[PDB]
Ligand binder design. Structure first.
Ligand SMILES: [Zn+2]
Ligand SMILES: [Zn+2]
Ligand SMILES: [Zn+2]
Length: 178
């Protein structure tokens, strides 16, 4: 197995996947690495299994259909994985913890949002449909863009949003378009 966490790329107290060479810190994996379970399979392996059990799941889908899906166990897992893929980018540090807003010429957002709050919301099964999760994720970046206006820091929001959206299209097999 790898000697660094797949998500944060640091060594430390790592838990190793039994079905692929990835390793994780306990709270870097989503959901948090399970207490017992031998063998243990990580979220990458669990997602690959879903795909392999239902090859047709990789045919293209309409986003509108995906968003209306109820958060049954497979959709819950897919949102957990998509959240993890965003944490895998180092620029996610800007969006992880609760933000605050005091900048001359801007007003903070009406509904602040951040990745750790989404992580808790998923853990506590607060989303009933995929739409709930996706709206909160997208709000993170939209708030950032709106607040930082013309400061070049706005680009961090564009960059992390692009990582989100590419992984959303991949994980939920959204029909390719120009
Ligand atoms: Zn880690
Ligand atoms: Zn694995
Ligand atoms: Zn089948």
């Amino acid at each position: 197995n790898s000697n660094i966490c797949e998500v944060c790329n640091k060594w430390g107290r790592l838990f190793c996947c039994d079905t692929c060479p990835r390793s994780f810190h306990e709270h870097c994996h989503i959901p948090s690495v399970e207490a017992n379970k031998n063998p243990w399979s990580c979220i990458f392996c669990r997602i690959k299994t879903i795909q392999e059990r239902c090859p047709e799941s990789q045919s293209g889908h309409q986003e509108s259909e995906v968003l209306m899906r109820q958060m049954l166990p497979e959709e819950q897992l897919k949102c957990e994985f998509l959240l993890l893929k965003v944490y895998c980018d180092s620029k996610s540090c800007f969006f992880a913890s609760e933000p605050y807003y005091n900048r001359e010429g801007s007003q903070g957002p009406q509904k602040p949002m951040w990745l750790n709050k989404v992580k808790t919301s998923l853990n506590e099964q607060m989303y009933t449909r995929v739409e709930g999760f996706v709206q909160d994720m997208r709000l993170i970046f939209h708030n950032h863009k709106e607040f930082y206006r013309e400061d070049k820091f706005t680009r961090l929001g564009i960059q992390v949003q692009d990582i989100f959206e590419k992984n959303f299209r991949n994980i939920f097999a959204i029909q390719e378009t120009s």
